[PDB]
Design a protein around this ligand. Structure first.
Ligand SMILES: *[C@@H]1O[C@H](CO)[C@@H](O[C@@H]2O[C@H](CO)[C@@H](O[C@@H]3O[C@H](CO)[C@@H](O)[C@H](O)[C@@H]3O)[C@H](O)[C@H]2NC(C)=O)[C@H](O)[C@H]1NC(C)=O
Ligand SMILES: *[C@@H]1O[C@H](CO)[C@@H](O)[C@H](O)[C@H]1NC(C)=O
Lengths: 78, 51, 98, 46
């Protein structure tokens, strides 16, 4: 449909080697954590296990797009 | 800048090469000369009967 | 030269070859013979209720797509060509780690 | 924009770059300097 052409336009001439605003300003990244479990505490090896959902948010203006769609929801594929 | 000469040698060597056929496939036996340098002979496990 | 003819034959075999299709895809089932050379039965654990075995596992079948009548000799190929051929999806049900 | 400069530069630097050959392939040797930052020495097993 139209999501395909949006995704194709977003990734045309897109270099994933360069961070957004690479020579302009630092990239600001907001971080969230959800702790599913703080696992066992091993006192002989000085370590603890923890399972989390790690969330990172930032702005990449190369990925800006004008459409009737407000948010593209994708899996790992991209 | 003599790196382009070596690059051309390298890309000409593999020109037409088929790494699925052993050298001498229809003509002769391929002889492999082998030697070993043991940097360390590890521990022996008599329980697992292995080394 | 002979290697040139072998290379030509292998390229002819593998061009237009669909790995997504078994031999006789729309027809009778393909017969696959199996044989095994057992080299080790290593650990028989009552704690884990399992045993480890090492084997040479050989599967033989026929694929008319991979037939050639120029070269008269059998062809042992570099093992990586297995990635470009169809092989049966054999698995072991009681297998825990392999 | 600096993004266009950086993109053009990075494309030019990787234009026809042979990873098979080291810097100064036939010339003198390349000098590699090493740093190490030890974060932990975990388990000394006898
Ligand atoms: C699970 O098993 C399958 C099949 O036994 C493995 O798939 C094979 O993976 C290898 C390595 O990822 C593939 O080789 C690659 O080929 C490409 C060219 O297509 C080359 O650029 C790479 O350098 C590499 O040589 C191989 O083609 C592929 N074979 C099939 C039939 O899919 C898979 O990797 C196994 N997974 C794990 C986690 O071991
Ligand atoms: C190919 O192998 C089969 C079985 O191993 C054998 O009977 C046949 O003679 C071989 N062909 C040649 C050309 O050696």
């Amino acid at each position: 449909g139209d999501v395909t052409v949006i995704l194709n336009n977003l990734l045309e001439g897109y270099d994933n080697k360069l961070r957004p605003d690479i020579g302009v300003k630092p990239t600001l990244i907001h971080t969230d954590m959800y702790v599913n479990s703080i696992g066992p505490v091993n006192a002989i090896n000085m370590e603890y296990t923890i399972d989390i959902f790690f969330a990172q948010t930032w702005y990449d203006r190369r990925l800006k797009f004008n459409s009737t769609i407000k948010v593209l929801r994708l899996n790992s594929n991209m | 800048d003599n790196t382009t000469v070596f690059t051309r040698i390298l890309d000409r060597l593999l020109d037409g090469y088929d790494n699925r056929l052993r050298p001498g496939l229809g003509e002769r036996v391929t002889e492999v000369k082998t030697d070993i340098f043991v940097t360390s002979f590890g521990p022996v496990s008599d329980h697992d009967m292995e080394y | 030269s002979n290697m040139s003819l072998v290379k030509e034959t292998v390229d002819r075999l593998l061009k237009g070859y669909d790995i997504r299709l078994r031999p006789d895809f729309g027809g009778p089932p393909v017969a696959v013979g199996m044989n095994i050379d057992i080299a080790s039965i290593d650990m028989v654990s009552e704690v884990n209720m399992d045993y480890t075995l090492t084997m040479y596992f050989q599967q033989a079948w026929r694929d008319k797509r991979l037939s050639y009548n120029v070269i008269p000799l059998n062809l042992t190929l570099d093992n990586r060509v297995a990635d470009q051929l169809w092989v049966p999806d054999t698995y072991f049900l009681n297998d825990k780690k392999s």
